Amino acid sequence: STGSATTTPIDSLDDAYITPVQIGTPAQTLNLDFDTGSSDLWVFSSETTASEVDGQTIYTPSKSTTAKLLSGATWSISYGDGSSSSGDVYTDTVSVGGLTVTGQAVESAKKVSSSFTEDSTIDGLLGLAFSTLNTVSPTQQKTFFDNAKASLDSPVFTADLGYHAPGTYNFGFIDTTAYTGSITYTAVSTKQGFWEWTSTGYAVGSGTFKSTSIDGIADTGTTLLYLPATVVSAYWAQVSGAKSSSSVGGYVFPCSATLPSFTFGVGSARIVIPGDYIDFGPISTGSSSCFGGIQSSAGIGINIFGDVALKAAFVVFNGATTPTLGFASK
Ligand SMILES: C=CCN(C)Cc1nc([C@]2(O)CN[C@@H](c3nc(-c4ccc(C(F)(F)F)cc4)no3)C2)cs1
């Protein structure tokens, strides 16, 4: 089997991407943030504290003939930005772009933090990291991809995110019309539960390539590109007026600037992020200070190839027995 679904940015900055997901019988369609950096499928629901729901579409398990309480199971997760959610668990039928998993764990939120409440466009998250990160207790649950894997034509999914435009998540096949050139595959470590790999280096603008190993994760659920402070300083040094602002929380640059591109290495291949992809716009409405899309990973503890990086490529998440990541230009 295969599936294919369109993913759409939630706002004019590509802050996140939402993909429609069918849950239950009759189907309830919720727009979920597909997150290759976590492993929980959770939704706003009829159980979510009323004061914490503000415009989201909710999953109502009592209206699904295929929903079953997963008795005794609870979940609780926090994300790298400090947000969090928690609740109980149902199993139900879940379909993405025509691909169906029966008995998928659907984690129903009883509580969500303010950042989730405040984002009316995101109805939940669909985690696509390795199931070893799933937070359901006492019986850890599998991701949608892990459950679908055996049924897929090929044990892969692909992320083809758009720049200020819709994109595609495919499961079970590689769309050879969706990229240029060849896909370069690179080794994955699953030891931390992430799609963790090692980039071979970087270049800034038209500069020469610096060969240097950068361990990091491919994370569709993170907006920006987080790299070591040395790399990030070398990038922003090329932009007149750019500075790291403690009060804003990262590098800002004059909105009057044209940004250089940033290239990252995948083995012997190269992915070029256009400078425009690194512009996240005014720090506040009307400001002439703009927020940078390349930021330091110092104190995160891990480098993150988030959407800024991934949307410049066609990305293959190969979940074969020996997992790998593929990157192609597009
Ligand atoms: C070893 C150190 C790990 N440390 C915690 C840094 C990391 N962090 C992650 C993510 O937690 C998973 N991938 C990212 C993600 N963030 C979201 C999200 C968060 C908030 C909203 C809200 F604003 F609507 F609330 C929406 C989506 N979704 O995914 C972050 C992986 S590694």
> What domains lie within the chain, and their CATH numbers?
5-174 (2.40.70.10), 175-330 (2.40.70.10)
Between the CA of 222 and the centroid of ligand 1 the distance, in Å, is 6
Strand, helix or coil for residue 283: coil
Measure the N-to-C terminal CA separation of the chain; round to a whole number of Å.
25
Between the CA of 60 and the centroid of ligand 1 the distance, in Å, is 25
Between the CA of 36 and the centroid of ligand 1 the distance, in Å, is 10
CA distance linking residue 173 with residue 148, whole number of Å: 13
Contact, 313 vs 329, CB < 8 A? yes
From 79, 116, 132, 296, the mutation candidate for ligand 1 (largest count of ligand atoms within 8 A of CB) is: 79
The answer to whether residue 199 is catalytic is yes
CA distance linking residue 4 with residue 95, whole number of Å: 10
Ligand 1 first shell, C-beta below 6 A: 16, 33, 35, 37-38, 79-81, 83, 115-116, 119, 122, 125, 219, 221-222, 300-302
CA distance linking residue 155 with residue 170, whole number of Å: 11
From 32, 81, 223, 296, the mutation candidate for ligand 1 (largest count of ligand atoms within 8 A of CB) is: 81
CA distance linking residue 230 with residue 113, whole number of Å: 33
Residue 256 CB: number of other CB atoms within 10 A?
Answer: 9
The structure was resolved experimentally with: X-ray
CA distance linking residue 252 with residue 235, whole number of Å: 12
Contact, 130 vs 107, CB < 8 A? no
CA distances from 190 to 34, 171, 197 (A): 19, 20, 9
Resolution of the experimentally solved model in angstroms? 1.5
CA distance linking residue 312 with residue 315, whole number of Å: 9
Which residue in the list 45, 108, 199, 297 is annotated as catalytic?
199
The answer to whether residue 261 is catalytic is no
Establish whether the linkage from the previous residue to 9 is cis, with ω within 30° of 0.
no
Pairs from 246-253 (Cβ < 8 Å, separation ≥ 24): 248/283, 248/289, 248/291, 250/291, 250/292, 250/295, 250/296, 251/291, 251/292, 251/294, 251/295, 251/296, 252/283, 252/289, 252/290, 252/291, 252/292, 253/289, 253/290, 253/292
CA-proximal residue: ligand 1, atom 5 (nearest): 80
Between the CA of 34 and the centroid of ligand 1 the distance, in Å, is 11
Q: Report the atom number in ligand 1 closest to the C-alpha of 78.
A: 11
Please give the DSSP secondary-structure letter assigned to residue 33.
E
Nearest to 220 by CA among 79, 3, 17: 17
Which residue in the list 33, 35, 160, 307 is annotated as catalytic?
35
CA distance linking residue 171 with residue 174, whole number of Å: 8
From 134, 222, 225, the mutation candidate for ligand 1 (largest count of ligand atoms within 8 A of CB) is: 222
Structure tokens at 41: 């499928």
Between the CA of 27 and the centroid of ligand 1 the distance, in Å, is 28
CA-proximal residue: ligand 1, atom 26 (nearest): 116
